[PDB]
Ligand binder design. Structure first.
Ligand SMILES: N=C(N)c1ccc(OCCCCCCOc2ccc(C(=N)N)cc2)cc1
Lengths: 186, 186
């Protein structure tokens, strides 16, 4: 599983030194693989990275699946998931390498394409919550996909453009948002 | 021009590339000058940047007023500000850039001050719209600043993380957002 070993070493290198400074050379030697093996599995560093991001997205889903059982109703799942997105990124190691990578390829439709497939995976969480909320009379939404992209992006905005305020303040605003939003659906 | 020529080329590269991707080296050469230049008015690099942000924030908040007249109620004002956010050429095209900046100077204090003193200029627009809406009885918000902040960030989110798809689809979501947010306020 040196494909797996490469993803691992790469994740760590990226975390320690960021996207730009990490060279496939380091990855090659530290994972005891080769330029060729690395080329055959990911073709480029960008792809390698995107690959990691999907693995990460997967772990996040897996995590959410276990964590969402703490929330009985969908209203609750909405409140909870948003809180998680805020508190977890506070200490997500890849966070900084992602920003680096993102704000460096959002100009390439090639990379930008896959970047959306990934983004869409994170949006499904909402889609599910919303779909389920319907089938339980918690709310009635006839445009799930829509409200889903909206929630996703609104929430990511609160997580991304607030950092400085103290952590409780943020959690507070987020929960406030989760309230206002959920309220304007009934 | 002298000073107001660098600022120009700067803003240009800060958007075209990242905050790091672009450096004084590039700015100087493409703005035909020397290093010294960038020192009396332009101390640090984050000085020239923090500057540019200020310019853009002002330009935007001004274009807003030279355009909010087209909205009789505040409910409409809210909607319009958010819709316009998506089409301007001011401030918002630097969110990606700002993100890097903040995530590379959040370890210092001279940042969480300007980078936070600008937050007022950023949420003011919503504060007025929400306060005035209270006097005008369109709604009743007793935690304006919270709501103002939550909105400023939710919106920035929708504008920033959808920036690469059908511009008219953006405008649609943004309106379903304004719709849903306002409906949750009462
Ligand atoms: N192994 C772990 N311990 C771990 C892994 C992943 C993780 O991930 C946290 C992820 C937060 C993701 C927020 C994504 O927000 C958006 C994504 C896409 C879009 C879009 N529509 N373009 C908008 C917001 C946290 C922990």
């Amino acid at each position: 599983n040196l494909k797996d070993k490469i993803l691992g070493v790469a994740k760590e290198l990226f975390i320690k030194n960021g996207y730009n400074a990490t060279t496939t050379g380091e990855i090659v030697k530290l994972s005891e693989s080769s330029k060729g093996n690395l080329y055959y599995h990911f073709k480029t560093k960008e792809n390698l990275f995107l690959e990691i991001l999907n693995i990460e997205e997967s772990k996040w889903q897996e995590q959410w699946k276990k964590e969402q059982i703490k929330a009985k109703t969908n209203r609750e799942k909405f409140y909870l998931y948003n809180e998680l997105s805020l508190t977890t990124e506070y200490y997500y190691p890849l966070q900084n390498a992602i920003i680096e990578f993102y704000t460096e390829y959002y100009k390439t439709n090639s990379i930008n394409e896959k970047m959306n497939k990934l983004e869409n995976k994170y949006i499904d969480a909402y889609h599910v919550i919303f779909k389920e909320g319907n089938l339980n009379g918690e709310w009635s939404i006839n445009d799930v996909n829509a409200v889903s992209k909206i929630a996703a992006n609104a929430v990511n905005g609160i997580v991304t453009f607030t950092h400085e305020q103290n952590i409780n303040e943020r959690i507070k605003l987020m929960n406030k948002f989760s309230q206002i939003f959920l309220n304007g659906l009934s």
